[PDB]
Design a protein around this ligand. Sequence first.
Ligand SMILES: CCCCCCCC/C=C/CCCCCCCC(=O)O[C@H](COC(=O)CCCCCCCCCCCCCCC)COP(=O)(O)O[C@H]1[C@@H](O)[C@H](O)[C@@H](O)[C@@H](O)[C@@H]1O
Ligand SMILES: COc1ccc2c(c1)c(CC(=O)O)c(C)n2C(=O)c1ccc(Cl)cc1
Lengths: 230, 302, 337, 225, 58
Amino acid sequence: VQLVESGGGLVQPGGSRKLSCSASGFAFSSFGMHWVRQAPEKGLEWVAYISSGSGTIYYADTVKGRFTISRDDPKNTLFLQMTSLRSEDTAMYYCVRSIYYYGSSPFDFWGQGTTLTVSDIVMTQATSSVPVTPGESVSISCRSSKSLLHSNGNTYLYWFLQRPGQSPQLLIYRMSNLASGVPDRFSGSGSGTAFTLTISRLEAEDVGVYYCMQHLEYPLTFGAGTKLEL
Amino acid sequence: LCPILEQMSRLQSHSNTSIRYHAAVLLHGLASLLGLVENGVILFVVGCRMRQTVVTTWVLHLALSDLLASASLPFFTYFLAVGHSWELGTTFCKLHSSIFFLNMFASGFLLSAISLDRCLQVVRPVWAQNHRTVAAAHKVCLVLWALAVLNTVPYFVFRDMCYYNVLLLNPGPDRDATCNSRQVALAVSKFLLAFLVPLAIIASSHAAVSLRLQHRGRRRPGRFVRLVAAVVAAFALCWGPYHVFSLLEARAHANPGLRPLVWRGLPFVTSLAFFNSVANPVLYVLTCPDMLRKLRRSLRTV
Amino acid sequence: LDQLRQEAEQLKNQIRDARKACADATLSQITNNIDPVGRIQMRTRRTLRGHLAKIYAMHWGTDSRLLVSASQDGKLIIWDSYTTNKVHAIPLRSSWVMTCAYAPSGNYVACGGLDNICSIYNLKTREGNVRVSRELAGHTGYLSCCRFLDDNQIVTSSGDTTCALWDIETGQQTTTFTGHTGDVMSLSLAPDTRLFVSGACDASAKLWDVREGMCRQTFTGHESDINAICFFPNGNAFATGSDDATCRLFDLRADQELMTYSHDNIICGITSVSFSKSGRLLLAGYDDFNCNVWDALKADRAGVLAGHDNRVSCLGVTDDGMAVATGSWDSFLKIWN
Amino acid sequence: TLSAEDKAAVERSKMIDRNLREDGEKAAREVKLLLLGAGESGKNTIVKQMKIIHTTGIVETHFTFKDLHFKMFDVGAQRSERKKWIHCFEGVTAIIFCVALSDYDLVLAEMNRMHASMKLFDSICNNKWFTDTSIILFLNKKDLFEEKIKKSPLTICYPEYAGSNTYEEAAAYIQCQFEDLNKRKDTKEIYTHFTCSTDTKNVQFVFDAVTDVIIKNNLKDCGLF
Amino acid sequence: ASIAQARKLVEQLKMEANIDRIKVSKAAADLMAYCEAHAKEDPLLTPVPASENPFREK
Ligand SMILES: CCCCCCCC/C=C/CCCCCCCC(=O)O[C@H](COC(=O)CCCCCCCCCCCCCCC)COP(=O)(O)O[C@H]1[C@@H](O)[C@H](O)[C@@H](O)[C@@H](O)[C@@H]1O
Ligand SMILES: COc1ccc2c(c1)c(CC(=O)O)c(C)n2C(=O)c1ccc(Cl)cc1
């Protein structure tokens, strides 16, 4: 499993850029792809998404109609054509995998991303910076404008951890399932709209930003992100 | 107005009295109900109870066509109840003629395609098994339905009594000659497209199958010839009379002596044709052991 | 040789006399003191479609929502009971699959058939595609049934009249169960996974132990090949179904049959058997295009589940007993509740 | 009402259903035949020649002849109870039965091999699952039979036999003996053929038999037969 | 080989003859008690209402 993005650099507003992500090490055909940008000193934001077999493609209102996301399963490559560039579009675009089935852990792998510079359910985190020494437990609270609990009987919530110089890492999905490979120190709970991510004992590897994501409606909104540093 | 319409305007047919006359033609309600029930049952079964294959796809399309044809029979029953007078405007007769001709062409094309498929399977078994698929069957069915819908534009234009009016769009200088020419052309076209060509294809396919069983040495049990003869006789007794009377009327346009017979015969034969919707399903559904057992079991369980 | 045969006959007569001495009372005389169960009506809820071949095996998951089914087309499908959506589609190299198993944790699945090799497929692979994990080879006969003893070890039954316990990490059989004169047809694991019963074509069943690897006990009474065998929810009894058109319930402590289930109108063999969560009712799949429910205490037919278009091949009750799935050769698996 | 993940799962299930339908349509594209007979009946030679023209368990051979794919299933190594798994081959197109024509005077540890072969043929033909499955008999030891009949008389195997010792009469009698074992002539037929050093003739005969059957199957499916 | 087979058979028969047994009446009573105890939590025997039954109309 490895994702390598290409394309970016300095681009004038009137120019266009074709970002190409080479997928390898997994069944690219069965796994859909999402694009998530991250502007300097800003939270994440969903850009576009392609479903398996190119049967369903979705875009965000901020980019609907302007950008064009395409896919090549025979070649196993994700393509993003950016026609027009605004003064606020500069951000690191990250490609993320997502497979949908009972018990699946979507958004588990995050690509390295590429730097490109140009010359809805609301999610809010109570605290942003919480200085704490290693060893002591930590708690990060989050609030959603709309009840993420669906009639089926589950809560569509995701927690991601982004370390300095590293892409986000999926911690917990559906508010109650720990992602594979993540230490058991992390736990998640919540009710209706108030959610909490608890860490039994913080460590050096936990230094970073924690972002929340709601997946009840396809338009995805990310919080400011709570930063933890020793 | 062509002479036929001018004469029909002063028709001296239906009358008044305490006793009831018309019932001979109105009796088609039982056949309509039977066709509706059979088509719905077979469609639902083959759709939500049996696997999707080529023969099943043809059966589903035939059942859908028969159901769409029979669903408009209550409207004609009501029309007859009023005393052979249309209560609605063009939005009624337009759709009635469109749906009628569409179902007719669809049934004809489906029968022709089934006959061609049987002929290919009996003559070209390897090529059929290598190439005959469900996707190709659905594509052929869609193409045939498109051709049928295309063949309905003239009558949809020329209808306007809910009956025919050919001088509606761009009437020519000579009303009589132009009307006669258009009527004869439409009659010959519908005859060649609905009765002659489909029946000829069916007969040719059956003859080829019989010759390809006699040459290979295979016997021909009585269950092949009986079904072939039954299908042929049903198709004939259902469709032949309709086109025969249509051609008789087209010729009577110039020969008035035949106009009365049409007025007395056309309402009957046109109804008898709908009995085809009740004959084709059985001969094409209950004749297969698998579908027959499926239907019988399902009915017993229900 | 003569002395050995005489000793065997004497031991058989002693075992028969001992089994008869314990038959102080029959289950019917004791169960006659309780009212019978009412008419059980089970209406089909979901009609799983997608198979194009005859079904031969199916198994539920611990979550009581996912169920893996095998078909002769060489495609293992994991259906979701609540939504009827396919979770995975494993293409088998050998389309002649006859048995399938779903591990407790659901991370691995086992399958086998005429290939005489048991294939294990991992569903939680990081690559994202279900790929064969381990191929357990060594059986000289077709795989009839298999069940997961643990995430590390598994037990398999082959038509060579001998079963084997294979370790996944090692891949070599550690214990070999021998003693059956006929081909073993089905298996059933106890709640504790310490003992397991296996039926064979010799019209007799055998209870074996895992760690010891020896036949703990034998049970007889059938007149034909035992096709299906299931463990009682309590773990002290087990039901068996053979081609003689009747089921038989045996107790591991009494060492003899308790009650028989049969009816005059039933003349065909039985394919599958499974108890409910509470064990108050038993279910048995028959060849007459339907399944039948029986009273485990009075043997009275509780109901008939009809709708299958071909011979009923397999049936299984969820761990919670909410609904029961049934698969037949007609390529359709129906859930009843 | 279905949420995002629910709709995505439904779409994935529909894609899986489409893939399964395509796979089934592709597989319905290959004929399936079951090979039966004694180990010394020449099955190995037939398989080898059919493979050239184009461990325990069952063998599966694939070959195409005249744009027609075949799947030969050999279950000879499956030395177990056949009546408990033979039903899996109910949908088989044909049963290629090989018998040792020359092995009529040898002894096997019925005592004779011809009687056992006849019993197996009768059991496979009169099987409740093969009521309509066609059978194709192949004699892979015609040359050995011709070479042996000149020295060893056929009366040793068939005492009631009284015809001439020539090869033609003996072959006709042996063929009729197996042909008479069919108790379902009304629903199924047998295609007999004598194999020799040549191999293309056997492939052509198998193709014709498979072509006849596919024809009868299609005729019975559409409702005619 | 017959000698070894007969020896194994007699050994297995002697082994199976030493296991302990109980009265059939006691086993039947225990099974009936288990069934009566677990009946209250048996959805099949006691159909649950639609409020809890997850199998409903899609
Ligand atoms: C007016 C009266 C009504 C007339 C009724 C007409 C219909 C009669 C129907 C009979 C039954 C038909 C069954 C369906 C199959 C027919 C469709 C068809 O011809 O395509 C065969 C199968 O096609 C495929 O292989 C796979 C492609 C996808 C499915 C084909 C969809 C096309 C459907 C036709 C729609 C138009 C109908 C017109 C109606 C008037 C075979 O085609 P072909 O032999 O040319 O190609 C083969 C071979 O050439 C080679 O092996 C190879 O090179 C490759 O190209 C290919 O494998
Ligand atoms: C007596 O004079 C008539 C009477 C009725 C007629 C027609 C001519 C024609 C035209 C003709 O027969 O050529 C059609 C089509 N009639 C229909 O009642 C009809 C029935 C069902 C439907 Cl769905 C649509 C129309």
